[PDB]
Amino acid sequence: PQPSRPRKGSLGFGPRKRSTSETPRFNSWPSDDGQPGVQGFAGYKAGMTHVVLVNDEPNSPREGMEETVPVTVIETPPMRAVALRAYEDTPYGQRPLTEVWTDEFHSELDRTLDVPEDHDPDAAEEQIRDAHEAGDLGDLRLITHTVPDAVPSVPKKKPDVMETRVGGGSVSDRLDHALDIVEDGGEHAMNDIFRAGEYADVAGVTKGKGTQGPVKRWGVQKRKGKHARQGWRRRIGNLGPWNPSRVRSTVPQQGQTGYHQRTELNKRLIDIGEGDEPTVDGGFVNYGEVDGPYTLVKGSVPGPDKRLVRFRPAVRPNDQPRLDPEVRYVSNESNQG
Amino acid sequence: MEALGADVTQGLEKGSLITCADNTGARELKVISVHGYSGTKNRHPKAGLGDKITVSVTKGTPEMRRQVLEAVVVRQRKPIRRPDGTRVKFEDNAAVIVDENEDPRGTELKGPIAREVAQRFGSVASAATMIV
Amino acid sequence: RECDYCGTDIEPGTGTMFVHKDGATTHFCSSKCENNADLGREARNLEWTDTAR
RNA sequence: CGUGGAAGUCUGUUAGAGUUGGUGUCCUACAAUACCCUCUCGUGAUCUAUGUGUAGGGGUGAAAGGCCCAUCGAGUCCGGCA
RNA sequence: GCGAAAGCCAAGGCCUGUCGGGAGCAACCAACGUUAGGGAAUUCGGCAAGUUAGUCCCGUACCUUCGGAAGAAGGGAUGCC
RNA sequence: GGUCUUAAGGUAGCGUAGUACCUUGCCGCAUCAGUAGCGGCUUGCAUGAAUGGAUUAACCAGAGCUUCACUGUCCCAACGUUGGGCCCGGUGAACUGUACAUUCCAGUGCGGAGUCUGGAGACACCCAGGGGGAAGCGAAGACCCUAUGGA
RNA sequence: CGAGUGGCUUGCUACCUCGAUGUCGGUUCCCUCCAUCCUGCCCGUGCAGAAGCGGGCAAGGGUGAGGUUGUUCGCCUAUUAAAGGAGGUCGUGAGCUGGGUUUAGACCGUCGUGAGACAGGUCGGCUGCUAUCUACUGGGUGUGUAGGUGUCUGACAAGAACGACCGUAUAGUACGAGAGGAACUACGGUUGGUGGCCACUGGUGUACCGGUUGUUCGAGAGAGCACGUGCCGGGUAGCCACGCCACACGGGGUAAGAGCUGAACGCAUCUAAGCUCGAAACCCACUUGGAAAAGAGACACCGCCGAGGUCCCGCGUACAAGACGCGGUCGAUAGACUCGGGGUGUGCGCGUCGAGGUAACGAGACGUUAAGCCCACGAGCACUAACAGACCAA
Ligand SMILES: COC(=O)[C@@]12OC[C@]34[C@H]([C@@H](O)[C@@H]1O)[C@@]1(C)CC(=O)C(O)=C(C)[C@@H]1C[C@H]3OC(=O)[C@H](OC(=O)/C=C(\C)C(C)C)[C@@H]24
Ligand SMILES: [Cl-]
Ligand SMILES: [Cl-]
Ligand SMILES: [K+]
Ligand SMILES: [Mg+2]
Ligand SMILES: [Mg+2]
Ligand SMILES: [Mg+2]
Ligand SMILES: [Mg+2]
Ligand SMILES: [Mg+2]
Ligand SMILES: [Mg+2]
Ligand SMILES: [Mg+2]
Ligand SMILES: [Mg+2]
Ligand SMILES: [Mg+2]
Ligand SMILES: [Mg+2]
Ligand SMILES: [Mg+2]
Ligand SMILES: [Mg+2]
Ligand SMILES: [Mg+2]
Ligand SMILES: [Mg+2]
Ligand SMILES: [Mg+2]
Ligand SMILES: [Mg+2]
Ligand SMILES: [Mg+2]
Ligand SMILES: [Mg+2]
Ligand SMILES: [Mg+2]
Ligand SMILES: [Mg+2]
Ligand SMILES: [Mg+2]
Ligand SMILES: [Mg+2]
Ligand code: NA
Ligand code: NA
Ligand code: NA
Ligand code: NA
Ligand code: NA
Ligand code: NA
Ligand code: NA
Ligand code: NA
Ligand code: NA
Ligand code: NA
Ligand code: NA
Ligand code: NA
Ligand code: NA
Ligand code: NA
Ligand code: NA
Ligand code: NA
Ligand code: NA
Ligand code: NA
Ligand SMILES: [Sr+2]
Ligand SMILES: [Sr+2]
Ligand SMILES: [Sr+2]
Ligand SMILES: [Sr+2]
Ligand SMILES: [Sr+2]
Ligand SMILES: [Sr+2]
Ligand SMILES: [Sr+2]
Ligand SMILES: [Sr+2]
Ligand SMILES: [Sr+2]
Ligand SMILES: [Sr+2]
Ligand SMILES: [Sr+2]
Ligand SMILES: [Sr+2]
Ligand SMILES: [Sr+2]
Ligand SMILES: [Sr+2]
Ligand SMILES: [Sr+2]
Ligand SMILES: [Sr+2]
Ligand SMILES: [Sr+2]
Ligand SMILES: [Sr+2]
Ligand SMILES: [Sr+2]
Ligand SMILES: [Sr+2]
Ligand SMILES: [Sr+2]
Ligand SMILES: [Sr+2]
Ligand SMILES: [Sr+2]
Ligand SMILES: [Sr+2]
Ligand SMILES: [Sr+2]
Ligand SMILES: [Sr+2]
Ligand SMILES: [Sr+2]
Ligand SMILES: [Sr+2]
Ligand SMILES: [Sr+2]
Ligand SMILES: [Sr+2]
Ligand SMILES: [Sr+2]
Ligand SMILES: [Sr+2]
Ligand SMILES: [Sr+2]
Incomplete structure (x- = not known):
């Protein structure tokens, strides 16, 4: 049949x-x-290596033992939250209201944008606050870019701009938190958002x-x-x-x-650090040498080496967070051989 | 079943001729089915290290031959992966005949066994000479 | 650990463990060493191995 | 034991003859019967060139209604015939 | 080398089995190489593919019209100096 | 039945056969499982003696079955090689064409509609693809019937 | 006995096609139906429990591997949660297969005087075509909305992105004389499906290195040919699966069902109004697409004599054309060189030894030599080439 x-x-x-x-x-x-x-950060894919870890899971019969776990090395230098966009609740969904920009811009941001010369951050901030009083304010998101110039192995100097949400307390307190990040220089690191051992969602173009x-x-x-x-x-x-x-x-x-967007869920961050601890002998094949801020993501991550990957705290985690895993050994063996 | 604590790449299929690592009188076993397994269309039902399989006695003593008995896969040629990433492979593909209560049909077991099989099937373990 | 063939230090989270018929255990660092062993070659007779030099 | 060297004898892409399977390639083809591999016979009832004979209800046929100039359960041409 | 066999190479002939240029040269197709573990589970059917292989030595069953079966099968050997 | 038609009334053998409807006959061998194959039985729908019966060593690109060995035939697909394929110069056909034609889901109709009806969808053009539809293209159907047809 | 529904069987009819709508079975790939085999939620029981029997809602997902036979059907085996049935021209031959039916050859049985026949059996016996339209999968060019860069929104669209099983604790517990023997819940794993990725294992690797047979260049050295690597051994990058990572819960509303309050009908009543619950099903959640959504969108900045874009040039995180992405001296984009990191496995030559041999000669051994040769990766490094320069544009 x-x-x-x-x-x-x-x-x-x-x-x-x-x-x-x-x-x-x-x-x-x-x-x-x-x-x-x-609610998110970004980096550039470097390559893969393995790490020896001590089992964090309380329900595992192997709790406390040495376990070899595959890891994807991603160079995560600090990003710049250059603006604060505000959305308003309209009967047709969420529509952008206004943006609050800065004065301090990265030297090579003019490779992507028509950088602001004349802007009024106070009139924009006022418009957002009148909307909050009216109860018409939707969500608050930051216009963010990456610094590819900080990464020597990535050829591009042209920043990758993307919007990222700010969530947390009350809409009044997070408006202020958002404005404080922007009004400085917009600089934030992986540490500011993520802690090692948390489950993140990695989005990438394959x-x-x-x-x-x-x-x-x-x-x-x-x-x-x-x-x-x-x-x-x-x-x-x-x-x-x-x-x-x-x-x-x-x-x-x-x-x-291929070359499609995928959002890989529940990816454990093994370790966030800085320096040359995860670098491979002879360099990562088709990438280069790592000597700076990095993240170690458990398993695979979408896209090839040099590609911009995005991070977000897991929207649907299955397990409870087991913070800062004991990293006994990180491999530095040549990927050639 | 209870976790093996090792990732197995099933090296056997339905119809595979394997060795009988015991003194039962049975020399060669032929795999018929794999307990608790359900495949997909066109896929040959696969068996691996630590699986309880149904077998037919191909070669052996007249009394043992042609009998349809249950067995446990003890050794396999295709590599398995231990938690420390190391691969472990054997010289042959072997199985030990077991009864309704998972107790070995014979008394003495020939050749080595994998430690993960020993953890799952205890009465087969406390009958094993070598455990690698 | 160390390779039961060439003698170099096997990078953890790498390698294969071959279990012989009798029960003897041979840890190999790479496929190269496994394949040289299958050719009936003894590690002492090859110059590239740490066992020889 | 040697000698002898028989054979519709054996192996054989020797030359040569044949054409089992791939139901491969081709199928407005290279070709109105082709290409490739595989396969069979290969001192004999063998294969082959040239010359010569048998002619259409007639030849020829180790017989398949096979073959008789891409034409055959009765060739081809023209005529009977519009 | 047993050989008018293969493979390679002379003498001789040819670059006219007569359209070219470009893309690590994608899908898909024709020919084909190599594929772990399993080993005919494929299919009407091992179709296709593969296995074996030359030479010497040892050894060789049923059956038989005594010719044959038979290279039965099976085992060993094989280079160079 | 314990002769009758029409002369005799199937002997040796072989037998569920390339012949056996029933039928995958029953028993056995073999397999985990065998409408297969082989052996035996065999009342044979409808075997049988030069309409030759039986048997058989040897032979076979003949039909069926089993074992060892071997393997990408399969599990389940991967990578590679050569020629195409794709882009450019040059050369340059054919098949096919009532018309209109961006269709889809239902309906209707000579009961199997891109074209009718109702709705839905639909900005134009071009490249590559594998072939779902045009009851696609190719051949005045060999099947079947018919003709006071043919051979 | 009576009443029906379906259009899966068979039959009937002769409406449609004989200037041809390609057969059966199978296969591959897609959608669907419910009369539900499993899975979820339920009601009854001749429901102690466990395992069942019967019924209800329910089509989300699943429903598999094999032996005989061309078979569909069926018989049989071992697994399984279960191995449900059916429609799509008995879906599917401009997709495959060609085993059966059904040409031409032949045999057997039966029938026939015979040619020859058989709704008997048997061996053999061919599978055409360069896609015009339409359809869909993906890729571009234009026009519309009416100068540009960057960021978004979300009308709608797709999804199974998840399905299922085993094991442990609960527990040898509830229940039961015993035999036997559960659940809620919390855990660990497996299987099928899905998406992605290559540190690890594995494959490939006609890059590369080595060994070696035949022959040719006199030997040596070093090479060509042996089908597109002669063969054998090893194998980097990359690509891959046999390798590795990820793929909830929870809300909301319901069905069957369990109920609350409650009247018609003083009572009673789950229902008539009202309400609390309750399915793997529905909706949200999550993933993917999506300004051509004609109401043709929003924000911020830059610019209208100049913002930006194109051509050009060096190249890939991209790629069949087109497209996409990056760099272009204010530079590390590509190449050379040198390191680093890797492959192979110890070069040529010379020296010692070498079974022997008068000597000539000599296969081979050792040393020099972790040698020699090689690299699709990385770093350093402006030496070489990213120069010169053109065009559009409110
Ligand atoms: C190209 O072929 C066709 O179109 C045919 O359509 C289906 C068909 C036919 C015919 O419709 C038609 O001629 C039937 C459907 C007609 C029918 O009535 C009937 O009973 C059968 C058995 C047909 C099946 C099929 O049969 C062919 O032979 C018949 O096929 C042939 O007749 C011939 C073919 C393929 C070529 C040799 C010309 C089919
Ligand atoms: Cl099975
Ligand atoms: Cl197929
Ligand atoms: K017809
Ligand atoms: Mg690698
Ligand atoms: Mg290695
Ligand atoms: Mg199948
Ligand atoms: Mg003549
Ligand atoms: Mg005839
Ligand atoms: Mg294999
Ligand atoms: Mg063959
Ligand atoms: Mg029989
Ligand atoms: Mg007689
Ligand atoms: Mg006609
Ligand atoms: Mg006729
Ligand atoms: Mg007549
Ligand atoms: Mg058709
Ligand atoms: Mg129902
Ligand atoms: Mg459905
Ligand atoms: Mg089958
Ligand atoms: Mg059909
Ligand atoms: Mg079709
Ligand atoms: Mg066809
Ligand atoms: Mg075609
Ligand atoms: Mg047949
Ligand atoms: Mg036939
Ligand atoms: Na004599
Ligand atoms: Na031929
Ligand atoms: Na005539
Ligand atoms: Na073809
Ligand atoms: Na007779
Ligand atoms: Na013959
Ligand atoms: Na192949
Ligand atoms: Na079509
Ligand atoms: Na009816
Ligand atoms: Na009907
Ligand atoms: Na069919
Ligand atoms: Na369902
Ligand atoms: Na069957
Ligand atoms: Na049809
Ligand atoms: Na059809
Ligand atoms: Na068919
Ligand atoms: Na066909
Ligand atoms: Na609910
Ligand atoms: Sr976004
Ligand atoms: Sr074909
Ligand atoms: Sr044929
Ligand atoms: Sr051709
Ligand atoms: Sr032809
Ligand atoms: Sr072939
Ligand atoms: Sr011959
Ligand atoms: Sr002869
Ligand atoms: Sr005339
Ligand atoms: Sr010459
Ligand atoms: Sr010419
Ligand atoms: Sr190889
Ligand atoms: Sr078979
Ligand atoms: Sr031999
Ligand atoms: Sr008799
Ligand atoms: Sr209309
Ligand atoms: Sr085409
Ligand atoms: Sr139609
Ligand atoms: Sr049920
Ligand atoms: Sr079979
Ligand atoms: Sr049928
Ligand atoms: Sr039947
Ligand atoms: Sr169907
Ligand atoms: Sr046929
Ligand atoms: Sr039949
Ligand atoms: Sr017939
Ligand atoms: Sr217009
Ligand atoms: Sr969205
Ligand atoms: Sr239990
Ligand atoms: Sr008990
Ligand atoms: Sr060559
Ligand atoms: Sr109710
Ligand atoms: Sr628009």
Whole structure:
């Protein structure tokens, strides 16, 4: 009666087309709980190494023992929160009201933006406060950029601009917290937002694989046995039945693979540090040497080396945080060999 | 079942001819099924280290031959991964015949066993000469 | 640990452990050493190994 | 034990003849029967060139209604014929 | 080398099995190499592929029309100086 | 049944057969499981003696089955190689074409509609793709019936 | 016995197609139905418990591997939570297969005087086409909204992004004479699916290094050919799976169902008004797309004689064209060089030894030599090349 089988690939990451922004854009943000803070950071993918760890999990029979865990090294230098955008609750959803900028800008920010010369931070701040009094204020987010110049292995000097939310206390107290970060110079580090041992969500634009067939793209079978020698090797059986007399968008077809935005959930931050502790002998292949602020993410992270990855506190964690894991050993062995 | 404390890459399939690491009279075992396993379309049902499998006696004594008995996969050629990242592989693929209560059918076990199999099946452990 | 073949220090979280028929255990640092052992070559006879020099 | 060297004898892409499978390639072809690999025979009822004979309800046929100039359960041409 | 066999190379012939240039050169296709562990589970069917292989020594069953079966099978050897 | 048709009334053998409807016959071998294969039984729908029966060593690009060995046939797919494929110069066909034509879901209609009806959707053009539909293209269906047709 | 629903079986009819709508089975890939096999929530019991039997809501997900047979069907085995059924031209041959049916060859049985036949069996016996339209998967160019850079919004759109099982504690506990034997909950793992990634294991690696057979360049050295590496051994980067990482809970509203308050009907009544609960199902949550959403969007800054963009040049985190991204001397973008990091496995030559041999000669051994050769990665380094310069634009 022909065996049942789940369909080839998922329909939830559709359409499988090229990403608009190489800079990932979060579609969801964490809940407002504790003290006001920026709900995310960003860095550049470096490569991989392994780390030996002491089991933190209280429910594991191996609690206290040495365990080898794979890790993705990401260079995370300080970022600059250059502005504060405010949204207002309109009957058509959330719309941007005004932005509060600065005077202090990074030397090479003019490679992406038409940097402000004449702005009134006080009139903008006043507009946001009248909206708060009116009860029309939505959420408060910061316009943030990265400093790729701080990373020697990344060729680009052109900053990657992205918006990040500020959640936490009351809308009055976090407006103030946001303005204080901006009005200084906008400088903040990974430490300011994340603590080692917490679960983060990493968003990234995947490795570009160009155009690939159904077998690679959707995981369909190759033609088996005798069918494999007739002139058809990696082409599906049919594009659909007689009726409906059309090809459904659900049938596995050829096209763009990779260079899509993915948001990898519940990624444990093994260690946040600075220096050259995670650097590989001979340098990370197709990247370079690490000597500065870094993060160690448990397992894999979307995108290739040199790509901008984004961080966010886990919106849906399964486990309770087990802060600052005991790092007994970090490998520095050559990735070549 | 209880966690092995090792990641196994199933080295056996349904129909695989393996060794019988005991004194039961059974020399060669043929895998028929894997306990608690349900595959997917076109996939050959896979068996690995630490799995309780159903077997048929291919080679051996006349009384043992053709019998459909249960067994435990003790050794396998394909590598398994220990928590410290090290891979562990064996010289052969072997299994020990077990009964309804998971007690070995024989008395003496031939060749080495993996420590994770020993942790899962205790009466097979306290019968094992070498535990690697 | 140290490699039961060449004699270099096996980087933790790397390597394979081969269990022989009798029960003997051989820790290998790489695939190169495993493959040289399968060729019936003895570590002492090869110049690149730490066992020889 | 040696000698002898028989054979519709054996192995063989010797030359040469043949054409089992791939239901591969081709299938507006290189080709109106092709290409490649695989396979069979290869001192004999063998293969082959040239010359010569048998002609259409007739030849020829180790017989498949096979073949008789891409034409065969009765060739081709023209005529009967509009 | 057993060889009018393969492979390589002379003499002789040719670059006319007669359109070129570019893209680490994607999908897909034709020919093909290598694939861990398992080993026919594939399929109407081992189709396709693969395994074996030359030479010498040892050794060789049932059956038989006594010719044969038979290179049965199985085991060992093989370079250079 | 314990002769009757129409002369005789199946002997040796072989037998569920390339012949056996029933049928995957029953028993056994083998497999975890065998409409297969082999042995035995065998009342044989409808075996059988030059319409030759039986048997058989040797031979076979003949049909079926089993074992050892081997392996990407499969689990389950990967990477690579050569020629294409894609872009550029040059050369340069053919198939096919009532018309209109951006369709989709339902309905209706000679009961199997891009074109009718109602809705839904739909900015134009171009590149690559695998072929769902045009009851796609190719051949005045060999099947079937019919013709006071042919051979 | 009576009343029906379906259109899966079979039959009937002869409406449609004979200037052809390609067969059965299978396969591959997609959507759906519910009359539900499992999974969730329930009611009854001849419901102690455990395991069941019957029923209700429910189509989210799952429903698998194999032996005979062309088989569909079915029989059989071992697993399983369960291994449900059905529609899509008995879905699917401009997708595959060609085993069966159903040409031409042949045999057997039966029938026939015979040619020859058989709704008997058997061996053999072919699979065309360069996509015009439409359809969808992906990629571009323009126009509309009406100068630019950057950041967003969210009408709508997709999702299974998750499904299921085993084990431990609960517990040898509740229940039961005993035999036997649960649950809530909390944990650990597995399986299927999904997305991504390559530190580790594994594969490849006709980059590279080594060994070695034949032959040719006289030997040596060093090379060519042996199908696109002669063969064997090792194998970096990259790409990969056989490797590794991630994939809730919770809210809201309901179905079946359990109830509350409550009348018609003084009582009673879960319902008629009202209300508290309650499914793996629905909605939100989460992931992906999405200013062409014609109400064609918002914000901030820059600019209208100049903001910005294009061409050009050096290159990839990108790539079939196009597109995308980065750098361009105020520079490390690419190459050379030198290190570092890696592959292989110890170079040529010379010296000692070497079974022997009068000597000639000599396979090989040792040393020099972690040697020699090589690198798709990294760093240092402006030496070389990113020069010169063109165009559009409110
Ligand atoms: C290209 O072929 C066709 O279009 C046919 O359509 C389906 C079909 C036919 C016909 O409709 C038609 O001629 C049936 C559907 C007609 C029918 O009535 C019937 O009973 C059957 C058994 C047909 C199946 C199929 O049959 C073919 O032979 C028949 O196929 C042929 O007749 C011939 C083919 C493929 C070529 C040799 C010309 C089919
Ligand atoms: Cl297939
Ligand atoms: Cl099974
Ligand atoms: K017809
Ligand atoms: Mg590596
Ligand atoms: Mg290594
Ligand atoms: Mg199948
Ligand atoms: Mg003649
Ligand atoms: Mg005939
Ligand atoms: Mg293999
Ligand atoms: Mg073959
Ligand atoms: Mg029989
Ligand atoms: Mg007679
Ligand atoms: Mg006709
Ligand atoms: Mg006829
Ligand atoms: Mg006539
Ligand atoms: Mg058609
Ligand atoms: Mg119902
Ligand atoms: Mg559904
Ligand atoms: Mg099968
Ligand atoms: Mg059909
Ligand atoms: Mg079709
Ligand atoms: Mg066809
Ligand atoms: Mg075609
Ligand atoms: Mg057949
Ligand atoms: Mg046939
Ligand atoms: Na083909
Ligand atoms: Na069809
Ligand atoms: Na004689
Ligand atoms: Na041929
Ligand atoms: Na004639
Ligand atoms: Na007779
Ligand atoms: Na012959
Ligand atoms: Na292959
Ligand atoms: Na089509
Ligand atoms: Na009805
Ligand atoms: Na009908
Ligand atoms: Na079919
Ligand atoms: Na369902
Ligand atoms: Na079956
Ligand atoms: Na049809
Ligand atoms: Na078919
Ligand atoms: Na076909
Ligand atoms: Na609810
Ligand atoms: Sr964002
Ligand atoms: Sr969104
Ligand atoms: Sr074919
Ligand atoms: Sr239609
Ligand atoms: Sr054929
Ligand atoms: Sr050709
Ligand atoms: Sr042809
Ligand atoms: Sr072939
Ligand atoms: Sr011969
Ligand atoms: Sr002869
Ligand atoms: Sr005439
Ligand atoms: Sr010459
Ligand atoms: Sr020419
Ligand atoms: Sr190799
Ligand atoms: Sr088989
Ligand atoms: Sr031999
Ligand atoms: Sr008789
Ligand atoms: Sr209309
Ligand atoms: Sr095409
Ligand atoms: Sr149920
Ligand atoms: Sr089979
Ligand atoms: Sr049927
Ligand atoms: Sr039947
Ligand atoms: Sr179907
Ligand atoms: Sr056929
Ligand atoms: Sr039949
Ligand atoms: Sr018939
Ligand atoms: Sr217009
Ligand atoms: Sr329990
Ligand atoms: Sr008990
Ligand atoms: Sr070559
Ligand atoms: Sr109710
Ligand atoms: Sr617009």
